[PDB]
Design a protein around this ligand. Structure first.
Ligand SMILES: *C[C@@H](*)[C@H]1/C(=C/c2[nH]c(/C=C3N=C(/C=C4\NC(=O)C(CC)=C4C)C(C)=C\3CCC(=O)O)c(CCC(=O)O)c2C)NC(=O)[C@@H]1C
Ligand SMILES: *C[C@@H](*)[C@H]1/C(=C/c2[nH]c(/C=C3N=C(/C=C4\NC(=O)C(CC)=C4C)C(C)=C\3CCC(=O)O)c(CCC(=O)O)c2C)NC(=O)[C@@H]1C
Ligand SMILES: *C[C@@H](*)[C@H]1/C(=C/c2[nH]c(/C=C3N=C(/C=C4\NC(=O)C(CC)=C4C)C(C)=C\3CCC(=O)O)c(CCC(=O)O)c2C)NC(=O)[C@@H]1C
Ligand SMILES: *C[C@@H](*)[C@H]1/C(=C/c2[nH]c(/C=C3N=C(/C=C4\NC(=O)C(CC)=C4C)C(C)=C\3CCC(=O)O)c(CCC(=O)O)c2C)NC(=O)[C@@H]1C
Ligand SMILES: *[C@H](C)[C@H]1/C(=C/c2[nH]c(/C=C3N=C(/C=C4\NC(=O)C(CC)=C4C)C(C)=C\3CCC(=O)O)c(CCC(=O)O)c2C)NC(=O)[C@@H]1C
Ligand SMILES: *[C@H](C)[C@H]1/C(=C/c2[nH]c(/C=C3N=C(/C=C4\NC(=O)C(CC)=C4C)C(C)=C\3CCC(=O)O)c(CCC(=O)O)c2C)NC(=O)[C@@H]1C
Ligand SMILES: *[C@H](C)[C@H]1/C(=C/c2[nH]c(/C=C3N=C(/C=C4\NC(=O)C(CC)=C4C)C(C)=C\3CCC(=O)O)c(CCC(=O)O)c2C)NC(=O)[C@@H]1C
Ligand SMILES: *[C@H](C)[C@H]1/C(=C/c2[nH]c(/C=C3N=C(/C=C4\NC(=O)C(CC)=C4C)C(C)=C\3CCC(=O)O)c(CCC(=O)O)c2C)NC(=O)[C@@H]1C
Lengths: 161, 68, 144, 160, 161, 160, 161, 160, 160, 161, 160
């Protein structure tokens, strides 16, 4: 995986080039938006389980999924789905702090689509839950970091879909 | 249902490992009866020293309720 | 584990140093909570590779290993197989008594690198262990 | 079931079934018609058992149906009643199966994360389960009542 | 693994339905044949080695398989063949006791065909050996469990072929 | 014993006993006096059973009492008869216990090394045990005969 | 471990003896009280957490142990102690069911005194908690198994002391 | 602390402290006096903060001071106030240490079993912690208030 | 960078970021402009630092430019000067990134096998790096000089 | 392990006391000593091999230890001994950074004396090497951190002896 | 087949075979053994391929097994699986023949009228064929996998 700074450093090391004005501009661009990211991450960590609760109630629950015959039926499958939601929110927080989707591409999206296809998981329901937690985090974080937080949730939803 | 309480000092004499290896070298640990033979002579094939072994759990009479 | 399986008295025996990390790993290997989750809903060249991945962090080396571990599973059951992996020299040199096992991706067995890359961190666990209620896969939508 | 449990243990030890396992299988198959009778009785009395258990739970714990309660509202109460019906069906499944594997893999594993995410009182649900236990044992003969009460007590202990 | 009772409970739990007359009929149908299953399983367990060597003498040995160039030649490969054969016998006993081929599909047949193709094991020869074991088991058990024993041997043979 | 097996499984899973385990314990304690009666009958008829088992074993396999046989000679035959009496005592122990834990701990595991080191025919010991089972079931009622024959067949399969 | 039946079988197998009248009398004596043991175990299992609560409230909490400088102090130490009393209750139930303190000696008492001495655990406080748990268990179980429950709790207290 | 965490991470790889894990130590020692001043300021107003937080918590959730409430009674409420004082002390410890590390070993791990065994509302305790957070942030400058609120929010999340 | 080292441990233990980690990220991000200005001067003085460093290295040990030396010849000396320029670039990378992840992954891991296969004196390479440290420190302000000296010191330590 | 800050925090947590002026002065002292410890740490990290190459010269080599019959005889024993110097130097650096010998007692000193007695290692020679390293470190670091560095080497020498 | 197409295009010009078409013939005969081996390998695993591909198809396109679906119902699904088996047989025929002449005449031309008359989704049949391609290529070597995938791609494009 890589963050923005290490990504620029690697992108220049591959060319064998010293850090010039454009690269330092990218680095300063990441440096300026530092505060909103850590504050959004702290509020998300503090409100993680509440976020999962509203996201479930808003996108998945009170439907045919929770009823018998659905994928979310039984406490085992419900615990699996809520653990997956907590996982997704945690790695979205990681990607938001790192300013890069490489960690999501590596440790999350790799093989998930085929495995969910094999297990019968609803991809549309997963995307809806991801968007619900995106909405709740956008509400919680405030205007400082809502957009940056939303971009990586959109990345996860787009990669799954 | 029998656990020996054994203590050994195995000296590494082939690689000179560069990280920690204190607990790996000197240790006291409980080992079940079904594996204590293999553990002991694995220690002996590593040039180890079997300082002490205890019976700890089971009875010394045996022959019933022992091979569980 | 979400206040789940864990190991009652095994955490205490670890923390009091009565038991070693390798001993705790062997105890976790042979139990109902491992047998039901990695031995029941699987055929029997594949339980061997899942066990070798969990305890050694790699795929099985060659075809001859699916003689040894296969016969161990067939004759002496799951416990003897889990003990053979733990007492194997490959486990002992790489991990020994007091380091938690991890993913390795070895190089030397001539193909074990790509086999290990595929078996772990390229393919996850399908085939949920319980056979009590399948998903009927007809409700992919949560519209309302 | 008992057959599944015995066969799984035998396969894990890589051996044929023990004489004790054979005897327990014989006893379970012998008690099958009695278990089926208990199951049909509870199935026919499913509505009244759930209703009486709900009233008993509401008398014992009015706070749950209070403004600061998880089941506050008519439809919140309906969801709780549906959960009690679900657990009654699970208890019937366990009674017919002869062991606790169906109840375990359907409605107890992960139920802590269930009612933690939904903020639902687990001891309150256990109290409701005890209420259904009383209502069900009121509709059964003593031997069958004890047989059902064992699984009800298992559910109560597991929901803790 | 699922037995007959677990299969019925599964088919009703998926629909979220209480047990009705049809489910009770299926359960009673399994219940009435329990004792014969126990007796036949005990007989097979007591005579396992006898059926194995009889099936080997009837289907495998005294042929090119036990000669140089055969697959079962050398004590190691013969041991592998008879160990597989004992696997077939024991798992057929398990399936017959449970009244379901779920164990046969789960812990036996999955990948066995590709495994035999990879090692070069003769599928037709092993099918014939399993058939010889089926005939021996049917002769030993008696009319009470002959057909119920033979159905899972046929299931195994159809899985291999 | 059934109690030992159930307690071992409960402790290994780190839980109280299951309803199935409780039911099997109840069934075993119910069948205890019948098991005691069967064991008393076998102990009382211990000598005739051993003698007849030895006689049928010798008739089936005269080679064992032939010059190159393990039991050739008077005292070698007496040792085989004492082994049969030992197995009778183990069978009575297993019948009173309800399972095969003491029997396995005393006389099965390591028995292959027994008769390989002594060069004794394990199939011949199994055949002697089978004739022994026939003699034992000749002196019991049908249900009790089946109950004893389950442990006898367990021993026969163990020597295999 | 050993139960009453296994202990008698061991004591006769060490002498190489068939079961006689005295052994039969001991077996009958154990058999005559099996059901009361089962019901007491069921009650104890159903009320395990309640017994631990009242034992803790009567013997441990509201004291200097739960204050700073006490062994009970901090949630980690307190929960470890309560997991200990849960162990005590479950293994006492096992001892009651098996009719033998062999399991208590094998899996609980062995080394516990030295472990508590090394850790600083108050043995007197543990004895008091065990006795309070025994009192609660005797109250819950009733007259039928009160002494049977109390004997193994006293065994545990004597082994610790 | 931050030093303990950095030293643990460096020792886990069997290496020396990298330049990256020395700037964190320098920043920690730079902010040390500010953290000490914040903790001492919170320590001066421990009684007022505890009392106001208890009042706010009781206004939000009067059910805990209801007959079916865990903190029903004068002494039961005094115990709740003492617990709030304990957690304020833990927050001060975390703020001075710079890393939250001691708070875990003191009062967050096992606290779920703590409050489940005492039957106390963990969400109510979280609400009380939020109340003391508001009281503390009412008595501090902006950056100091934010710094304390980080640890308060961490404790609230740990009580989840 | 600091981001990778502060995210890898969080991923390893499976949690969201701790406040010490967040505030060390604050120190890192606040020092961003000064880090960029520090790295710019070293790039301005790229081809002039290496010429001074080479002279001090060869004056300290001329044997590498001797006929039995590894750096004998015009093109051999040019290659060594190119390696010194490589390490100066890597030091600038570490300075801007705030940690040693790029430096480690590009030019230290396996460098021992590198210079052993090439038979180049690693202790000589260490003095060559230290010469670059001195020449770089000569052209920077005191705080910035110490800041760059930390990364030069890390490279010198890892090289041997 | 524990640093000065964690030790003070634990010593106040055991009493359940808020921090006071007495602990505040102790914390402020470490905060004053923060910069010099970090500045001295990088010097030792850069000069680790050079520091070891002189203490060995002034204490161990050119003696009977490196000759036949010596403990440091043979390449394996020499490499292991110098790795022991590296261990001592790194953990002394950690101790001087953390302001406490807790880690030294935790991860170095426990079992070391008995292990050296079992393996035949000369404790006096090891103490002499540690003292030589202390001399070299005190020479390199300067007046500012000389005594602070020296106290932990003295602690290690006293613990071994 | 390649023989058929070469002979037909030669007879179109009414002349004897050119040498290039002869080199075609030698290449085709040389590859024929490998082609027949690949076809036999696919033939041995025909049931697993169709089963897994049908599961994959129902996963991707659930509307066909929806109430407004052409293959709604168990017999309608069985007919879909029989069609998939038909296409697998045709692909094996194409692989053995080398040229795609039999497949076009048997199950390609007129398939538009096929599924228009039956009201079946041709894109759904394409998805099923693609899943069949994936499962079949999972069981073959890379060169053989590409050789089969070419014919599978012909089926997917020609049902367009
Ligand atoms: C909102 C939740 C949806 C849902 C999910 C669901 N998932 C599973 C099972 C698994 N999920 C995973 C996931 C991962 N493995 C990884 O390595 C990663 C990234 C690091 C992920 C995200 C895996 C491997 C499984 C299978 C094993 C396991 O259960 O742990 C399940 C259970 C299905 C089953 O029982 O077979 C569910 C229900 N289901 C929905 O309906 C939601 C939309
Ligand atoms: C009648 C015997 C026939 C025969 C068989 C044969 N099989 C193998 C190898 C294996 N067979 C199995 C089967 C299983 N192992 C298990 O553990 C299970 C259940 C979990 C089964 C069903 C496996 C996995 C192997 C590979 C590993 C092993 O050998 O144990 C062999 C050996 C092939 C070789 O030499 O490589 C043979 C010979 N051979 C015949 O001639 C008969 C038809
Ligand atoms: C806001 C108050 C909430 C509440 C609390 C409550 N607590 C108790 C009893 C105890 N609380 C503790 C707490 C701790 N021990 C520790 O080591 C720490 C970490 C520093 C803490 C916080 C303990 C040990 C007890 C037991 C009694 C004792 O201290 O001796 C009670 C009393 C319960 C009872 O049954 O008497 C209450 C009510 N109750 C609420 O409603 C609030 C949410
Ligand atoms: C993946 C399955 C899809 C699907 C198919 C579907 N097919 C039918 C019915 C028929 N299909 C055929 C096909 C063929 N005849 C040929 O000669 C060949 C070439 C080898 C083919 C492919 C025929 C003849 C029928 C009619 C019945 C018969 O075979 O006698 C149906 C049933 C339609 C009905 O009205 O009953 C279905 C559903 N449906 C899907 O949704 C899938 C995409
Ligand atoms: C009733 C005595 C208690 C109570 C319960 C309560 N439950 C819900 C909501 C749900 N409960 C479930 C339960 C299950 N799903 C399963 O698969 C199983 C196993 C068979 C169970 C038990 C589910 C899925 C939900 C979510 C809704 C849905 O089913 O789609 C609520 C509503 C919560 C809300 O926020 O609306 C309540 C109130 N409440 C009490 O007071 C009692 C303690
Ligand atoms: C409880 C009534 C008292 C108490 C106890 C206490 N114990 C520990 C730690 C341990 N306790 C054990 C216990 C056992 N060893 C065994 O073999 C079994 C059977 C399963 C038991 C019950 C062990 C091994 C430990 C050490 C490992 C661990 O902590 O799990 C603690 C924690 C001490 C610490 O913080 O290090 C405590 C507090 N304390 C009291 O105040 C009670 C009177
Ligand atoms: C000689 C061809 C090369 C060379 C060598 C050199 N060696 C030393 C010092 C020592 N060498 C050893 C060697 C061993 N100890 C053992 O147990 C074994 C295995 C049998 C060996 C090979 C030791 C122990 C020392 C240290 C002094 C001592 O023996 O007590 C030096 C001196 C280095 C110094 O700094 O003083 C030298 C120079 N030098 C060359 O140039 C040759 C290529
Ligand atoms: C060096 C001046 C002296 C000397 C040392 C010597 N040590 C060993 C072997 C070991 N030393 C250790 C040490 C540690 N492991 C740890 O984890 C720590 C703390 C983190 C320490 C200090 C251990 C465990 C061993 C044994 C395993 C191993 O060899 O790695 C040897 C080798 C002994 C042998 O040949 O078996 C030697 C020679 N010897 C001297 O003469 C000096 C006085």
């Amino acid at each position: 995986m890589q963050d923005a700074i290490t990504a620029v450093i690697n992108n220049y090391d591959v060319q064998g080039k010293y850090l010039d004005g454009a690269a330092l501009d990218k680095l300063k661009a990441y440096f300026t938006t530092g505060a909103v990211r850590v504050r959004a991450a702290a509020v998300i960590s503090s409100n993680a389980t509440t976020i999962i609760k509203e996201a479930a109630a808003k996108a998945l629950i009170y439907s045919d999924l929770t009823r018998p015959g659905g994928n979310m039926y039984t406490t085992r499958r419900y615990a699996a789905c809520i653990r997956d939601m907590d996982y997704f929110l945690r790695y979205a927080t990681y990607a938001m702090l790192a300013g890069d989707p490489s960690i999501l591409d590596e440790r999350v999206l790799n093989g998930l689509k085929e495995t969910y296809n094999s297990l019968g998981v609803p991809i549309a329901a997963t995307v809806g839950g991801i968007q619900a937690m995106k909405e709740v985090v956008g509400g919680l974080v405030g205007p400082d970091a809502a957009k940056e937080a939303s971009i990586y949730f959109d990345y996860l939803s787009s990669g799954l879909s | 249902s029998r656990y020996f309480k054994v203590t050994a000092c195995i000296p590494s004499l082939k690689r000179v490992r560069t990280g920690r290896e204190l607990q790996n070298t000197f240790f006291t640990k409980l080992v079940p009866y079904e594996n204590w033979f293999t553990e002991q002579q694995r220690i002996q094939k590593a040039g180890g020293k079997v300082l002490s072994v205890k019976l700890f759990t089971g009875v010394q009479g045996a022959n019933t309720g022992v091979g569980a | 584990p979400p206040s789940y399986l864990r190991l009652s008295e095994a955490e205490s025996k670890l923390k009091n140093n009565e038991i070693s990390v390798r001993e705790f790993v062997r105890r976790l290997g042979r139990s109902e909570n491992y047998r039901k989750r990695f031995f029941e809903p699987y055929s029997s060249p594949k339980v061997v590779e899942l066990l070798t991945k969990h305890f050694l962090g790699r795929a099985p080396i060659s075809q001859q290993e699916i003689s040894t571990y296969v016969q161990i599973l067939g004759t002496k059951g799951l416990a003897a197989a889990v003990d053979a992996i733990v007492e194997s020299p490959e486990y002992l040199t790489i991990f020994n008594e007091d380091i938690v096992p991890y993913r390795r991706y070895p190089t030397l067995p001539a193909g074990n690198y790509r086999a290990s890359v595929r078996v772990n961190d390229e393919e996850l666990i399908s085939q949920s262990w319980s056979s009590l209620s399948p998903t009927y896969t007809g409700y992919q939508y949560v519209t309302r | 079931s008992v057959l599944t449990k015995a066969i799984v243990n035998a396969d894990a030890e890589a051996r044929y079934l023990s004489p004790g396992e054979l005897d327990r299988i014989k006893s379970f198959v012998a008690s099958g018609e009695r278990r089926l009778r208990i199951a049909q009785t509870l199935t026919e009395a499913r509505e009244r058992i759930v209703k009486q258990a709900g009233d008993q739970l509401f008398q014992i714990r009015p706070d749950v149906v209070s403004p600061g309660g998880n089941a506050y509202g008519e439809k919140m109460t309906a969801l709780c009643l549906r959960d009690l019906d679900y657990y009654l069906r699970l208890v019937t499944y366990g009674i017919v199966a002869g062991d606790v594997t169906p109840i375990e893999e359907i409605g107890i594993i992960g139920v802590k994360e269930m009612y933690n995410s939904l903020q639902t009182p687990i001891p309150a649900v256990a109290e409701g389960v005890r209420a259904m236990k009383n209502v069900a044992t009121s509709l059964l003969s003593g031997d069958d009542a004890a047989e059902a009460g064992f699984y009800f007590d298992y559910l109560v202990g597991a929901m803790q």
